[PDB]
């Protein structure tokens, strides 16, 4: 298969600091974008997306334009307390109405300790 592993179930990060959510693709196929969400279900919010917009408070950890890229790790900056939540790295596949959810990483609970 292609497997989406998020190896950290938690990350404990200081308020105002940068948080890295690790996510790695074991293989490149099927072709299609990566997408970071907060929560599961319909009210999951879209936190990053390869193919869409710019996201002001999200750099990406690796250069995505490079060819055999399999790291999809994100850096949310200026983490505020209400950035706590569960984040899910999700592979979508190619479609026609297009880009259907293929596989989700098992999740990375974020938590902000207000600390100097």
């Amino acid at each position, epitope marked *: 298969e292609l497997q989406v592993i998020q190896p950290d179930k938690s990350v404990l990060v200081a308020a105002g600091e940068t948080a890295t959510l690790r996510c790695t693709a074991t293989s490149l196929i099927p072709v299609g974008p990566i997408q970071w969400f*907060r*929560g599961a*279900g*319909p*009210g*999951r919010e879209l936190i990053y997306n390869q193919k869409e917009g710019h996201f002001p408070r999200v750099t990406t950890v690796s250069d995505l334009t490079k060819r055999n890229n399999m790291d999809f790790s994100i850096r949310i900056g200026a983490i505020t307390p209400a950035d706590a939540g569960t984040y899910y790295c999700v592979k979508f596949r190619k479609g026609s109405p297009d880009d*259907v959810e293929f596989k989700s990483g098992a999740g990375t609970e974020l938590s902000v300790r207000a600390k100097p």
Partner: antibody
Amino acid sequence: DVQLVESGGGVVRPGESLTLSCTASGFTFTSSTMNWVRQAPGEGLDWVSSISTSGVITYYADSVKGRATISRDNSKNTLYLRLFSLRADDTAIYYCATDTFDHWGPGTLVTVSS
Amino acid sequence: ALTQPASVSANPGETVKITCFGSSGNYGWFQQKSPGSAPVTVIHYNNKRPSDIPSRFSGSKSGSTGTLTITGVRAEDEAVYFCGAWETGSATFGAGTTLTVLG
């Protein structure tokens, strides 16, 4: 354990407004999405609305878009649903459900009637 | 949009599959013993079984289709089963698959 307790159920007069509550325990409400689904007695489940962790994104079903507000209050682990200009159509048992519909409230029967 | 079988009949001890399509999203299967009584999730997010629910219940997504598999159906699995699917931004349910055990 997870426990969901709806309330607000009863009769409301057609064309008027009413709010459902749902209290949640046994899980991390803040870090969790929420939905409302309803079921006209002896008919099918119908999605009504969803809400994000934060509360800033709300989604709604054509059922009720415009004339419902879904809301949450994480400070007291409670989820809401004001419903406006109530119709015979809307008479239903209304269930809150977590996240990916993994746990369900016992439901609260709302009857639109004069 | 979701179509699912209006009813399927099965003999005890046998392996029934109900399937559901109409969505590109993730699928859940919700049990309902009787009209009125609350739904109980037998599978969510395609293939996750709650700790509670017994192991004869298994879920799969392939293509844009969901399949609930009861392996060794029992008298107490006799119920109504609704598939539902969600994407980011929306959810939907099927019209319900009433299952009865022969015998």
